[PDB]
Amino acid sequence: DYTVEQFADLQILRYKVPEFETLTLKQKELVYYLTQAALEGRDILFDQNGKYNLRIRRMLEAVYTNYKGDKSAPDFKNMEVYLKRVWFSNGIHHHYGMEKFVPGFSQDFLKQAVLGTDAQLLPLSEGQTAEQLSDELFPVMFDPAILAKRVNQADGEDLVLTSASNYYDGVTQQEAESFYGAMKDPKDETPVSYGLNSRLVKEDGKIQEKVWKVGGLYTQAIEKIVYWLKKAETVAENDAQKAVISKLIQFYETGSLKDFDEYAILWVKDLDSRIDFVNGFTESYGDPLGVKASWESLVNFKDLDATHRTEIISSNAQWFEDHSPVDKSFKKEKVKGVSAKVITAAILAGDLYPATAIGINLPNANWIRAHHGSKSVTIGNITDAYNKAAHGNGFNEEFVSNDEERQRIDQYGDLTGELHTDLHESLGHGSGKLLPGVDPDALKAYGSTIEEARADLFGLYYVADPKLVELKLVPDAEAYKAEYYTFLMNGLMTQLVRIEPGNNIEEAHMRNRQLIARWVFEKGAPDKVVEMVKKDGKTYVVVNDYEKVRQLFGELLAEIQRIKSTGDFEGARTLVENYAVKVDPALHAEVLARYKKLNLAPYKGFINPVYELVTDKDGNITDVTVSYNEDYVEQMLRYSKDYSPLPSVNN
Ligand SMILES: [Zn+2]
């Protein structure tokens, strides 16, 4: 059963760990130790998303598990949904829309609930009462004007002070850009990531950094991570993988950002190990300035059979770059060579739990990828969990135009959808090269939208190529039409189920899909390439010429590749704001009404399996078992009890 529970706008799913039982005992132990190092870092993300998140959580968790009143009352059920969303979003803000949750319960209820809870169980400071803890946390929860956005990206506002994230403390956005612009090296051909694993604070009167390391900030959790990484080091598969674990331990112990670059080099060079993992401060989407990286972790092992399709996409990387529809001046003379593979996720943690991604391209250091290479991974068991949970839910029966399209989607939608993700992560982000002297940050806050659009267009253009039929990546030349329809139907229409009524598209991913869909829709109107007809009051997206759709994909890819490589900022502003922002209220209200009858949640998340060490009668380890019988509430409460080593307050 891939469906666990559904609440609010969130749906909890499960995923299997296929072929885990076939691993050796030394591999199962290495997986176990890496998964343990992953789970210990859950508290690190909560504190990064807000200085009150660890206190608001442990307060609600103490009230939830010790509530004495009627547990079937609307006040308790609405508090239960609130706590579940804080668990899902690793904070009090929406994981996708960045807006703060609105409590569906009164303050008088929570006040009497806190006072009715044992004061010893609440996250009280030294010599603090439950009243003082309520007076400080209630305005954070109930006042809509306090910490309204976890990540702000509005013009004319101090993005550091208007963001509820806890990456800066007592520092203005002007003082942060000047702080790193100064330590910005000039003639440095291998620039370190500056301020990646630290909190920029103003202790006393100086502007300094509190590095996240052993003996420093977040040391209570990092000591646990290093402990399990040392255990994983003793059962490493080979010396290349062992050096990766050892160098990562040094990065945690010293906080040296130079060791992180050395770790990223060794991690890229470890291509032959079956078991791989990510554990550290990786992606910087949580920072409004984009400099600090949130903590995430992923433990996986190579999917041997599924990797052979992604190794054909990699061995033909020069073919896809040469036959690209972009201008010849933007094509790379020789591809950098990306090591692409399909992985089976063993566990999720940090910013990858419970809401995770299906494809990751690392490292982020631009110079490390050029001189040493990158690793592109596709998570097969998560994509499989998405499909089998959505199989037969009747979402396509409601929004697809005709039954003849549904039959093609049911046959090739999973394959071409999974194959499009392979092209996106392994070749979409890596392909193309900027013109000499063009600022890589010339698109400003439009780079994230244009980059994902450029990668989606690369996957869409080539998933239809007749070479993938020659390379036996698709069973026939009609398979791409399933992915083309679902992408257009989602961008033009069905993705609005994730939008609040009266709002526009704000998130970067949802923007590039609508940008690609509406651009092809407008430019294909004279030939009726894509239509949006209505039948009995229901609007359907109709595709009439799938070949012309591909040509329009190439034209938009050539124009987007030109905008990125030449740094045309105002050109990207025209594209993103004219196609990827406006939402039709009449269509949006129609889609929501049709969607509500399906009883589906637009956002998905996964709960991790449960790994157990099997010991003999004398203490030695004989097996490592994996279970899938735990539920959402049980797992979050267990992680809060056994994998929560950080204090409630970290300033
Ligand atoms: Zn991507």
Residue numbers in the entry: 25 to 675
What do the authors report?
To verify if this conformational change is also characteristic for bacterial DPP III, we crystallized the Cys-null variant in the presence of the competitive inhibitor Tyr-Phe-NHOH. The solved crystal structure revealed that the protein is in the closed conformation. We succeeded in growing only one crystal in the presence of Tyr-Phe-NHOH. This crystal belonged to space group P21212, with two protein molecules in the asymmetric unit. The structure was solved at 3.3 Å resolution using molecular replacement, with the separated structural domains of the Cys-null protein as a model. In contrast to ligand-free bacterial DPP III (open form), in the presence of the inhibitor, the closed conformation was obtained, with the binding cleft closed. According to the DynDom program, this conformational change can be described by a 28° rotation of one structural domain relative to the other. Compared to the human enzyme, a smaller rotation of domains (28° vs. 57°) was observed in BtDPP III in the closed conformation. The zinc ion in the active site is coordinated by His448, His453 and Glu476, as in the open form. Instead of the two water molecules coordinated to the zinc ion in the ligand-free structure, in the closed form we observed a large undefined electron density. As the resolution of the structure in the closed form is only 3.3 Å, and the electron density is not well-defined, we cannot determine the source of the observed electron density near the zinc ion.
